[PDB]
Symmetry: D3
Subunit: 247 residues, 6 copies
């Protein structure tokens, strides 16, 4: 166990998930920070750079805060309320905030590959062109798929049973939010079952009409699974204390 500098953590992460992989206009990289020669005693991993995560980072003496989601998607020019409180804590404690978003989704053994491997997808391919998600054939019954889901991801997934599903069906997976109306239409042409998160009403109705079976294992869980794999990957390779904050 040893102290690392900020650059060295960043180059290691960017080796695993190159910034080249992020879809256009994704706010990846350094979120908050100035000096990358800052010395790091404690790396914190989180899904969200939420207020309570940042408070907890300060309480636990985190020096480098890694989050999957960027601090801001839409840019701002006034600093009040919640964003004031978050930046104040990060700045007063001089805590570095860094994010790997879609580049962590897409890269090999990333969040989507983690799901694809979990379901042991036969000859998996990118679901989208950019290329988010994985699609392939699940060599098993629908109910062995659900049991794997319940065991490793979320024990109470929402199932939109739009049609009967035969063994050896085509399965698409997308970590996080993949259940938009436009996504449903697209995936309906490519798979029998769609595993993702953040189901809403209109998407549910749409999936039923198209006969696409949708499984909502929550936005949180479908990502945290991969994040745990990512956290174990860092711990094995870096001589550095690493904790998780919101999982």
């Amino acid at each position: 166990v040893v102290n690392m500098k900020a650059k060295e953590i960043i180059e290691f992460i960017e080796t695993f998930a190159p910034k080249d992989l992020a879809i256009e206009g994704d706010n990846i990289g350094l979120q908050v920070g100035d000096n990358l020669d800052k010395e790091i005693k404690k790396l914190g991993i989180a899904l969200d750079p939420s207020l309570s995560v940042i408070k907890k980072a300060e309480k636990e003496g985190v020096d480098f805060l890694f989050t999957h989601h960027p601090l801001l998607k839409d840019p701002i020019r006034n600093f009040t309320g919640v964003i004031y409180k978050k930046l104040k804590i990060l700045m007063e404690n001089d805590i570095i905030l860094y994010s790997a978003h879609t580049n962590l989704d897409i890269c090999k053994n990333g969040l989507n590959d983690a799901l694809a491997e979990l379901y042991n997808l036969e000859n998996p391919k990118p679901l989208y062109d950019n290329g988010l998600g994985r699609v392939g054939i699940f060599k098993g019954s629908f109910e062995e798929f659900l049991e794997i889901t319940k065991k490793y991801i979320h024990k109470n997934p929402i199932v939109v049973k739009s049609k009967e599903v035969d063994d050896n069906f085509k399965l698409a997976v997308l970590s996080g939010y993949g259940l938009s109306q436009s996504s449903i239409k697209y995936v309906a042409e490519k798979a029998d079952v769609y595993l993702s998160g953040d189901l809403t009403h209109h998407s549910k109705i749409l999936a039923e009409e198209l006969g696409l079976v949708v499984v909502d294992a929550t936005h949180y869980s479908t990502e945290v699974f991969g994040l745990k794999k990512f956290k174990e990957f860092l711990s094995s390779n870096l001589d550095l204390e690493i904790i998780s904050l919101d999982f």
Copy 2:
């Protein structure tokens, strides 16, 4: 009997089309002759394929839905939209929608929720006219039981903070739980009741200390829709059924 235009004038008297949010696809969805004579009106939340199939089966002549058939325009007619239009057209079933104009109007879907909780001194939540906000004269757990009894028995409760009696309560029928809505409503109420909660919105409400209650998109509208159906039945000499509720 009664003609289709006569059904439309009644609805548009209650919920004028001008009340609708800009570019909301309200009004006649599918139909040609409005002097068509109507013996059986059907009410639905969604103009879904199964709703439309069920309408044909039940001999519905006028299909009223809260949601429009299409939000985004199209120029090809294949797959699901082909089947839906084929059924409606071959049977000459009129499809008509009152969307946000039904949300906003007096005694509409939001007012229905506002009355249920008996909100003291109610006001529109947004300026365009969506949602209601007011004081709930009671404890948080009397609010929750009313929710469980009349709306949805298993609402997701994001308990961002302790809630004292006589708190500010905002209600929005349908989809009111976007990130933009959370930020806006956090400044106007202590508790926000709506539908279609997603992760980022949940996190955001927690940061802002807004208590959010997701009683589902479906249920928070169907409540008002049932009231609307009873209103139509009281005033129109016409067989009226509900299709997806």
Copy 3:
């Protein structure tokens, strides 16, 4: 010798002649109205326009596959009333498939523009635009031998904007349908002496006069129907299938 075909077989044959990739950007080609393409087809109807009367005539003649050059809609819609209601009703209750080959039929080999280029026997023909619309080449003859061919085979009374005297062996551009927009006039003025197309309007006439471009309006309809008949003769020769024309 006369036989029923499935819709997909007809579509694949047409797309062999006029591949869908040949169509210019955002052109609404392909399946307009229909669902099941294993539908069996006894009667193919060809039309220029998917007009209300064309569709009525298709239903009256028991057409099962309706091919039109123009798409049903250029601009998308989200309400279905009036005329579009009547057209979709007829097509759907009768399960008539509506399918379109638009600019891909204009551009392809032996397509609508090639038909014109071939008619006028254009020496060393080239595409008029880069996307692939129109043909331009040398007309090996006088201007009035050009006019007589036009009057005999395309339209008996074409509008001629005589912007200048035209010498023999002139450059002739052809564009089936609507090629007489102001931007088109300016562009073609740099590439040809005479421009044969359809749908002339006032400002375009004035503009052609200023540039000295001779414009011949043989109508939108006729400059396309000529090629469409060739296309219909092509289908009739290759498919054992009853094929009629509806608006020509």
Copy 4:
């Protein structure tokens, strides 16, 4: 009289605020508006031949209905070079009243409305274009008036039979776009305008709207002649027409 005084007279008759948004009305080409004007020319189009003819007739003030340019430019070659050259070396002022002349009272559309003696006339569009009203007569008395005063051989799209005392809409110039056909079909039995094209013809047939194309040129020149005679009556000034 000076150019500004002529301009002020025209803008009294057709105020510039009446023009639909982004219509390129007003001074097209010119510098000194205190210049004194000895010969005014009226034209439909500021075409090359119109401008050449203006210089030949010694016109110093050229009024056109259509603006010189709709689309702005930043290079000066070819035809636009020649037109600006002729106007500038001879100090000929080019001025346009476009849709404001269409919309204004006794303007181009009103001229048509008065010609057909439309009973209880109203503007066809909300912005101010076109007139619609009832024609107190048969369809063929409408045609006879058209053939006598506007165009001897108008294209008639007879989409349906027309009863006496029908609703007649008029729009001088180009009113036969697809969007216009759809809109006017809800307001009239017969539509008189110009510049018919194929798809618009088909659309009118489907909707049962009877369309009469008396050409873009003729439906405007009629009003322009009225406008020219109006100027001649009020201004002590030599006034000629150039393309009509």
Copy 5:
């Protein structure tokens, strides 16, 4: 013994935020609690790094700047903006801005210039209400003498034409010498007083025969800012200093 609400309310009384040009980033720039108690107010033209550093050294808790901290929004916090927010946040210094609303308001930055030259019948130069234009009751050389004495000792003068006495003078505090501004003002005045002249604007002014006087962006605003500072000091029981002037 004054809190932030009261200072902000006072400023917005003088220069209402509604007077600001559309999408002008006025108001609270950096801050959270406005019940914070304020004993030392700092006034600055620019919220620059050195201004903010100087604010910390002088123990300023409320920092007022004419220019907003950011015009273009950002979503990353590194480099210079990191340093600035860090200083403001750990010291809990409130940053608040009155920009174009201070330019336009009565007795604001533009009116300050108009009074200085004693413009007869002054009127707003633009429709949004930036700048003042009126007649200068004097010669051009009395105008320059007032300029050199009170604004800037050596202003750039683009003498595009001779200027007669009792000429029309337009003034705009800050940056008013854009090419479009030159075209517009050329039609309304003989002489244009502003700041931040660039080449193309100089050339354009010469062609149009508009005499332009560049008394710098800095000086034409600081003049009004000094009036504003003295106004605050007269009305507020509070230590008030200037930072970059």
Copy 6:
């Protein structure tokens, strides 16, 4: 020589494809390019007085660095009227090589780079504007070269102390925008350009970038004079300068 031959020579030296964006380069005003040329005039700006001077000196081919118009127009009044009238009545060709003259080799930026003899010079931006390199010397010999050859009273924003053998970036014309300051601050210690404004000054101070404003005019005229000497050396043609 014919006009096309001159254009062809210039475009050999500064190819039009080198220009950034839809930069309004090339033929500004003119029609016949088989015109034979009696006097070529070179100017920085196609200003009214430059054009007046061109007509006075009997220039028939007017070359300017800046285009006549950046934004397109559809009305021809006031100043643009006066400029076009003079050019058209005298049949004077107006032609511009703008950013293609900035970017090309031995162009305006290379001229500055050579003046300061930048060791190992490179393009400042990716499109190819400006040059950056090492100035083998102290800051005050950089200033002494600036005051003697470019402008006697340059504005110096001394954001920090400058060591010998520092990185110097040059951009002829307007390179002192806020976005440019931010970009260059990461690539150089000293930035030599023109058209400094307040916000850019403040920004340079925060970033520690030393900015030297030797005016928009002078930083380009330096290169333009070299370009004029090049044309004079290669073309048998009377060549004068108009605004420098």
